[PDB]
């Protein structure tokens, strides 16, 4: 039948204009006294899913 | 019996990342080191950990800081 979509993946990425995926950053939940000021400033900027990971989870997000 | 050894740390990768007479940009790393093994020359800075980086664009030259001392410089050639 119809192919199902990974609901957990749909809550973490968004598709860009050229078909790429825009993701968020990790290591930002708590324990902020153990990280430098420069580290925390640069962890607030979004990134892109790498090409190595894209080849593995491309079928998961096909309706997105 | 048993042993008390077997521990180690991940190998940090230091050395010279640029060659003599090679064109570099305005933020290229020229040398990674602990302490001072090569001094900063002209148009060369120092970081938190002792590392040498270029400030302008040009060639890379390793020179002699007198006796048993060394420096690297960047010259704005072309």
């Amino acid at each position: 039948p119809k192919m199902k979509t990974h609901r957990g993946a749909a809550k973490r990425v968004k598709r860009t204009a050229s078909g790429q995926l825009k993701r968020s950053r990790a290591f930002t939940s708590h324990l902020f006294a153990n990280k430098s000021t420069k580290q925390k400033r640069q962890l607030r900027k979004a990134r892109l899913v790498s090409k190595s990971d894209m080849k593995r989870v491309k079928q998961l997000l096909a309706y997105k | 019996s048993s042993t008390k050894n077997g521990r180690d740390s991940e190998s940090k990768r230091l050395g010279a990342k640029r060659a003599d007479g090679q064109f570099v940009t305005g933020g290229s790393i020229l040398y990674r080191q602990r302490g001072t093994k090569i001094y900063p020359g002209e148009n060369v800075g120092r970081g938190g950990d002792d590392t040498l980086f270029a400030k302008i664009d040009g060639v890379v030259k390793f020179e002699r800081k007198g006796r048993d001392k060394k420096q690297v410089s960047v010259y704005a050639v072309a």
Binding site: H6, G8, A9, K11, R12, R23, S24, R25, A26, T28, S29, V49, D53, R56, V57, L60 | -
Partner: protein, 49 residues
């Protein structure tokens, strides 16, 4: 993935929410209006037709 280490979509956090009262508009550019002759009335009843 199966077994192994933690999957990529498990070590990243969720972001944002969605709006129930979201409005989306159909966009028509100025260049697309050159079809109609000058000095005429344009209505949403005419753009669709």
């Amino acid at each position: 993935f199966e077994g192994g280490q933690l999957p990529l979509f498990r070590r990243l956090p969720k972001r944002g929410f969605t709006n129930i009262n979201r409005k989306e508009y159909a966009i028509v550019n100025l260049d697309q209006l050159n079809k109609f002759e000058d000095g005429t009335e344009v209505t949403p009843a005419l753009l669709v037709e």
